[model samples]
Target chain A: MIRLYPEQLRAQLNEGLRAAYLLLGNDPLLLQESQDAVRQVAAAQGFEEHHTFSIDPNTDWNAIFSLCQAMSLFASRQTLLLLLPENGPNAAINEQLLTLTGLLHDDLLLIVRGNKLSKAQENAAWFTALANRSVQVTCQ
Target chain B: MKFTVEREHLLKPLQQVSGPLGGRPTLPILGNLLLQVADGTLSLTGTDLEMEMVARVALVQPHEPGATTVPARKFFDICRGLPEGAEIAVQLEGERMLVRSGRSRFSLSTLPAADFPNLDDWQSEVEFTLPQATMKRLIEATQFSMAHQDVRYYLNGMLFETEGEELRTVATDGHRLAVCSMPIGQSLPSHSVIVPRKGVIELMRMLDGGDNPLRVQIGSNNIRAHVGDFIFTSKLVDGRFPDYRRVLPKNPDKHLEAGCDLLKQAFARAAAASNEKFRGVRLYVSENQLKITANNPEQEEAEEILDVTYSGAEMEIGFNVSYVLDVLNALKCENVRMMLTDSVSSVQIEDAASQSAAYVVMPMRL
Candidate 1:
C-alpha cells in the first residue's frame, strides 16, 4: 500500500525490510533508472547475483516462476527482477501474478517494474492483487 | 555446464566473436568463452575486455542448468574439425571440459568463468529497433573509412548516430570520409555513439543483409545491439566525434557524372601504375572528356579516358585512388556524381540519383 515519487524511492530503499517494488511509468529511461536504483540497493544488501527477464505480453508465467524458485548455490542472496511491458500485462500474466501470491513474499528481492498505470488500470483486481503486497513508485 | 548443440551452430557464432580472442591477453580468461545454460537456452559469450558478443540458442537437449568457461580457440577448433552434423555434447568435469562427438573426443582446460570480464551492467539509455538491412547498409557504406590504429583514437571507429528523424553513419580516416543516411520512422531520442574499430569490423562480419528486427540500445560508455540470435556489446571510444557538418563540403559549383563501373575499372587501372607507396592518382576534369592519370618513379605511367558529362573549367585534383575506389565499391550504383569547388576543396560524391548515401574525400596534394 506504500506509494512514493521517483526521487523519494531511492531515499526510502535503506529504510527497512523490503520484498517487492514496481516502477510505474512508460518512459524507458525512467524505468531503467528506477530498475538500476533497485539493483544497486539489492547489491548493497548482499543480493550480488542479478538476472533480468524482459517480459513479453504473451510470456508463459512458468518461465519466470521456474527461475524465481531456483536457488543459487554459491551466492546466498539473489536479486530477481522481472520487467513488465509499458502498455499492460496481458490476462495470462495476471492469472500467473495471482498464482505468485505466496512466492512473491520470500527470500528473493523481487522487483517488477514498468509503465504508469491509469486510474482504471490501478483499480483493476489484478493491480490490486499486486499492490496489496508491493510498494508502488511512480516515475516522472 | 552441460548442453548439446549442433556442431554447425557453434562454429559461426564462435568464429564471429572469437576474432578478438587469439592474441596473448592480459588475463588468461580473456582467451576463454563463457557458457551458460538457463531456461532451456545455451548462451555462449566471448570478450577481449574491449568488446563482447553473446550468441544464444534454445537448447533442445539441455539439462541441469549450469555455466562455465573454457578456451575459446581450442573449443572452436575442435568443433570445426569435427565431421558435419556432429552433435556436440559439452560438459564440465572437475576443472576441464570434455567435448565428445562420436568417438573423437578432447578435454580442454578451463578458466574460472567469473574471471571473464563482461560489460558492466548499465541501463539502456537509448533503445531503438532498426531493420537488419538498414543497419547493415549503414555500416557497409561507411565502415571502410574507419581509421586503423591511429593516434587520434576517435577516428578509429565509425560514428553511428540517430537524430531528428534520420539515422546516419559516418567514418573518416582524415584523408577521406564516408557518410550514409536513411530517413527513419523510429522515435529515437537524440543520441550518438562511436562504435570502436574492432566493434565495427565485427559488425560487418556478423550482421546479415535481411529484414529482421535489429534492436540497438546505447548507454553512457557502451552500446549494445540485438542482431538475430546474437547480442553484442562494446565500450565506446569515449572521445567526441568530430563535427561532420563542418567537414561537409559546401555546394560545389562544378560537377562530373560517370558510370560507376567505368570509374572503378579506370581507377583500378590508374591505381596499379601509381607509386605503390602513395597510391595517388590525378584527375584532369574538363569540358567533355575526363582523364585519369598516374605515374611512378621508374618513368611508368597509366592513363584512362572517358567522355561527356562536364561543362566547366578544367580542374585537376589528386586523390589516393584507393579512397575513390572504396567509395565506388561500397555504393553499387549505375551512375556516380562528383562535385568539387576547386582543386583544393573536398570532393563530394553521391549516387547521381540516390542522395541517401553520400561520400566526401579530401583532395590530397600529390
Candidate 2:
C-alpha cells in the first residue's frame, strides 16, 4: 500500500501510470485539488487542448474504457482524468471496478483516492487481489 | 459546386443534425452529414441508423450541382458563428469541401456521399396531414416520459397510436409515463408504432410553430413527416409496449390540486437536499396545504410548502423530484392535479383543464 498526503500524492502520481487516472475522494476540496494537480502534470507532459479528456461522475464508464484503449493524436500520449465523487462505489460497482483494476495495462494508469475504505471493502477478496497487482495510493 | 447560405437557414437544420450525430460514431460515415445540391436546392441529411433528417433550402444563386458529405457538427459551428445573412459558399474539390464566407475560408474533409446509408424503403399504408401546431403540442406533452436506453427496448421510444379520428402519443421509462391525445377532424387509418427516442426529438425540432399543415406518412417499418422543405424519417422500435392502460390506476384514493408555477418552485427548492442517487422528495399532503421535504446523505435538508386544495387522507409519499419537475415544466399547465393510490403505487398528474394529457410517476420509499 502506498500512503501519502493529498499534496504529495497529487504531485508525484503520474510517474508510474501511463496516462489515465481515477481520482476518488469524499472531500470536495481534496477532489478538486487532486484533479487540478493531475491536469497540471498532464499539461506538463504536453497533452493540451483537444488531446486531454476529462470524465467526471456523469461519464459513461463504457465510453471511458473505449477512450483509454484508443490511440492518441499527434501528441506522445493522451490522458483520461476520471473524477469519482464522494459517494464512490456500491457493491455491484465496486466489483466492476475490481475487474477493471485487474485489466489495467501499461498504457492505462488508474489513481483512486477515497476518504477511507470500509473494513469489509478493503478486506474483500477482489480488493486484496487488486492490491497485489497495481500501485495503491491512499490519501488522508 | 458550393454556394453561400443564410445563417438562419443553416443554423436551424444544423441544430437538428448535431443531436443525432454522436461524437465518435460507430461508423466513420455516420459522423458526417450528407450535403447534396441539385438544381437550385441544397439538401442536408443527418442520420444515426435509427433516425434521419433531410433539410432543404432554395439557394440564392444557382451554381454547379454536386453531392458530398462532411462532418455535420463541425460545419454547423463554422456557419453558426458567421454573421447573419452572410453568403457562405461551399465548394467540392476531391475529398474536401472548401467553405468561404467573407475573409474566412476553411477546407473540411469530406466523406463520399455514396457511403451515406438510406432509410429502408417502406410502403406508406396510411397518410394524414395535420397542422404543425397540433403536432408540436402532442410531442411537447409526452417527450419527458420517453425511456433512454432501457432494457425494455419498447420503452426506449414514444408510441404513436392513432385510431378512428383521434391520435395519441405515449411514452414511458418505467419510472414515469406521459400520454397526449389529440382529435383529428378527418378520418385516419388505424395504426400504432413505436418511434425511437432520437427520431421523436428530431421530429419535434422539425416542427415550425406555423399555421402550415404537416404531411405525415406512416409505413410498416418507418414513419416520415414532411414539414415544409424538411423531411424527418425514423425506424420504428420493433418491440411490444407495456399495457399502459392497465398500469394506470382505476380510482385514485387521494387527489390534490395546486398551482403549477407554485408547485414547481416548491419542488425545485426541496430538490436541493434530495439524495443524488435516488432524489426522493417526501410529500406531506393535507386538506389545504402541501409540504415537501428532502434530505440527502450529507445531512442537508430542504423543505417547502404550498397552498393547495385536497380532500383525501393525509399522506406522506416519496418520489423522484426531477421527474415530477420535468413533467410539470414540459406540460406548462396552469393547474396540476395529482392522484395517489398508495405509498408504493405510481402517482398520476393531470392538467386540470385538459383530460387528453396526463403523466404518471412511480413513488419512491422514504
Candidate 3:
C-alpha cells in the first residue's frame, strides 16, 4: 500500500503501472486530472483498451463490477475506470467493494473514483483492508 | 454630522449599495450602510464577507463633514417612503442618526463608523476598460452552466480566462460545459480567476447593458469593477479551475445544422417524456432529419422529427435533453451548428453566425 499526492503521481506512473488505484476527492477538476494521468500512463504502457462507467444514484453496482472484470481478461492490455456511485459509504456496500477489490491482479488494472469518504468510514474494516493493499491517492 | 441632498439623488446610490448587506448578518455592523460626508460629497457602502459595493453622489448642500453607520433597512425605507424629488436632511446624534424630509422624521440606531468591515485595499494594478454591453453578454451567455454548490467548489463560479487577445468565460456542472469568448483590445495581465456564483449574479444586476464604459481591475485575491457611479468588488474563489483546453474538442468539420427555434421546440416536447431521473433523449440523425426520441420508466415514448441540413451515416446518440435546450436558449441565432463525430464523442454546439462562444456536451448511455 502506498499514499501519493497529486504532484507526486506523474513520477509514480512513469516508474511503473499498478493493478489497482483508488482516488478519493471532493474536487472534480483535480480528480479528473488524476484519472487522466492514470489512463495516459496505462495506455502509454501497452494498456490500449479503455472503458468507463460513470455512476449515478441508481447505478447497478453489480453490473458495473461485472463489466469491469469481464473486459480485462479478454484483452492482453486494458484499463477499467469506474466513477463509483455517488453515495455515502455503508456496511453492505463496503463488503461489496471489498469483493470487487479482490478482483485486482497483475494483468487487470482497476481504477475507482468516488466522493470523499469520511474519516470513520475510511477506517472501516473493509476500506482498511482495501487501502492496505492498493495504491491510494487523495485530492482536496 | 449634517448633510442635505435631493431625495432622488441619494436614493439612487442607496439602492445600489444597500443590496450587499446581509439579512441575518453574522456581524452586527454587516447589516448597516456606512455613510461618509466629506467636502460636499456623500458616499454609501455596504458589504458582506465575500462582496462589497459602493455608490457616491455629490452633495447639493453640504452643511458639515462626518461619517456614521445607519441601519440599512430603516434608512432605505425612510427614503422610499418620502415623496419623489423631495429633499432629505441627515443629522447624527449620540449613537443615533436623524433623517427628515418634508413633514416626516425618523431616527435610526447608528453603529460606530470604525466598526464597519471594509474590503481589503487590493492593489488592482491590472485593469482594462470594456463596453458594458459586451461584459454583460459574456456573463449572461455562460452563467447558466455554472455548477450549484458542487463538491468541486471552483466549478460553482465561472472562469474568466485570458491567454492571448481572447477573453473567455467557461462554466460547467459536470454533465455539460458552456463557454464564450470575445476579442479584447490587449492581452490579459492575469491568466485566470474564478468569480464566485453570488458575485457573478450581483455583478449582472449592476450592469445596465448599455454602451457605457466599464473599468475592470483584477487584483491578487479580488476583482473590482467600476460601472458608472457604482463600484463593485468580489473575493475570488481560491481553487484551481479546470483547464478548458482539455474539455473543448476540435473538429475539422460541422455535421448538422438545425434552426434554433425548431430544435428548441422539439427538445421541449421530447423532454416531457424523458426519464425524470436521467432526462435522457436519444437523437437519431440521418439523411436530412433529426429524430429525437425519449422514454420513461413506464415505457412511455415521445419522438419529434425536425428538419436539418445534414448528410451523414445513420447514428444514434443519447444526451440529457436540457443540455441542448440550454445552448439553444442562450444563443441568439437563427441556426445552430452541431459537431458530432460518433455516438460516444462529445457534441459541440455553436451558432451558425460565429464561433465566439460554444458548448460541449458529453453523450450518455441509454
DockQ per candidate: 0.01, 0.02, 0.04
When only chain A is evaluated, what TM-score does every model earn?
0.82, 0.63, 0.78
Ten-residue stretch with the least lDDT total in model 2 chain B? B271-280
Question: What pairs collide in candidate 1?
Answer: A25-A115, A25-A116
Q: What's the TM-score of each model vs. the native?
A: 0.67, 0.64, 0.72
**Candidate no. 2 TM-score:** 0.64
Residues B59-113 of candidate 2 have per-residue lDDT tens digits of 8776778899998878988998788888788899988899888999988998888
Q: Please tell me which predicted candidate would have the highest lDDT against the true structure.
A: 3
The top-ranked prediction according to TM-score is: 3
lDDT of each: 0.76, 0.72, 0.77
Off-target runs (Cα >4 Å) in candidate 2 are: A1-140, B1-19, B31-40, B59-113, B272-279, B285-292, B295-307, B312-314
Model 3 agreement with the true structure over B1-366: per-residue lDDT tens digits: 789888989887888888855569787898899998888778899988798998878877757889999888779989989999899999998889999888899899998988889874869757787788878888998999997865568878988877676677888865577888877788776478999999999988999977678888888899989998889999999998876667555652438899999888887878765544343577898888889887453576657788899886778887666678889998878999888876655778899998888888777554
What is candidate 3's lDDT per residue for A1-140, written digit by digit as tens?
Answer: 78887677898878866777778777777777888999888878666556566655455664444333332111335577777656545546666567656545554578878767666667655566656556777765
Worst 10 contiguous positions by lDDT, candidate 2 chain A:
A67-76
* Cα shift from native, residue A134, model 2 (Å): 29
Candidate 1 residue spans exceeding 4 A from truth: A1-140, B101-106, B272-279, B295-305
Worst 10 residues of 1 chain B by lDDT: B271-280
**Candidate 1 TM-score versus the reference:** 0.67
